[PDB]
Amino acid sequence: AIRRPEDFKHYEVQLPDVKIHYVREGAGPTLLLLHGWPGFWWEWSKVIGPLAEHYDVIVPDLRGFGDSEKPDLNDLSKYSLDKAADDQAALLDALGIEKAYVVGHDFAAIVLHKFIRKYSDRVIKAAIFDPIQPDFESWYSQFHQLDMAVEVVGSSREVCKKYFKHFFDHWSYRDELLTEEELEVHVDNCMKPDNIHGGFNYYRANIRPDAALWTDLDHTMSDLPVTMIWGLGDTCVPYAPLIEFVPKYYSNYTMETIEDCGHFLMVEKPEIAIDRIKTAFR
């Protein structure tokens, strides 16, 4: 089951705006896999290998996450999802890739929504995985606004581990998402300098009342074939609004719920993730 971080081929590029760390492997049309919160590129570890047999898989850490650069922690303009979408275009440019299949998970589903519109000519087909977090202005989005939260959650591995374990588990259909080993890999990443704060900044910069999460361009319609897939979750029914609003911004799409699966499709149901992607992206 586990394929540790060191077991992949790593890279780091200086983009005009930020330094991005990514993992890459495989051959064929390019496949950009984008993570969300909590986590980093590694959440895709179970699915990279299999997908690499048919695609040139690229899995970067979003700015503010993993080994990617954590811009000025006090400058929230550098933590907007708009910047993360620009970073994807910049990455493809640096790697001389004209078009790519893109898969956005959680926060990255928003990045993808932005990207397919701002860089429509750079995407072949896209897929959105679990764009909505379970308990939503949520208690944690508010908690993440506090510096006290950064100071507490990052006070020790013990604490950091308990905190993130809650989200991994609570947001999953089954009782425990990760093995002790896998959870430890996430704690290793979380404890890296500025990673706790960098992740919380995504809430501070984008999930706020006065925060402008959507642009004029985001309101436009997309004919691009998009594949929406999310798990029934630990419960059911907060995805109702999405189901109603999607047709207002997407003309070419599909939706699917995965029974007995939570927020981390690529983690809880690897096989399903791989299957859905292989069928849609061809």
The dihedrals phi and psi of 260, each to the nearest 5 degrees, come to 70, 35
Q: Is 113 a catalytic residue?
A: no
Instruction: Mention every residue, 6+ apart, whose C-beta is less than 8 A from residue 228.
Output: 127, 128, 131, 242, 246, 253, 254, 255, 256
Nearer residue to K ion within complex by CB, 99 or 165: 165
227 vs 47: CA distance, rounded Å: 17
**What backbone phi and psi angles, to 5 degrees, belong to 105?**
-115, 140
CB-based contacts of 231, cutoff 8 Å, min separation 6? 130, 173, 257, 258, 260, 261, 262, 263, 265, 268, 269
* DSSP secondary structure string for all residues of 140-152: HHHHTT-HHHHHH
Q: How many residues does the chain have?
A: 282
Q: Write the binding mask 220 to 239 for K ion: x where contact by CB under 5 A, - elsewhere.
A: --------------x-----
Work out how close the CB of 235 gets to K ion at its nearest, in angstroms, rounded to a whole number.
10
206 scored as a contact of K ion (CB under 5 A): no
Are 230 and 237 a contacting pair, CB within 8 Å?
no
133 contacts K ion (rule: CB under 5 A)? no
**CB under 8 Å to 235, separation ≥6 — which residues?**
134
Q: Does 172 bind K ion (CB under 5 A)?
A: yes
Our answer to whether residue 106 is catalytic in this structure is yes
Catalytic residue among 22, 163, 173, 203: 203
Cα distance between residue 45 and residue 178, in whole Å:
12
Smallest separation (angstroms) from K ion to the CB of 169: 5
| Catalytic residue check, 249 | no
Closest approach of Cβ 231 to K ion, in Å?
11
Annotated catalytic residue, options 56, 86, 87, 106: 106
Catalytic residues, by residue number, are 106, 203, 263
Q: Which residues bind K ion (CB under 5 A)?
A: 172, 234
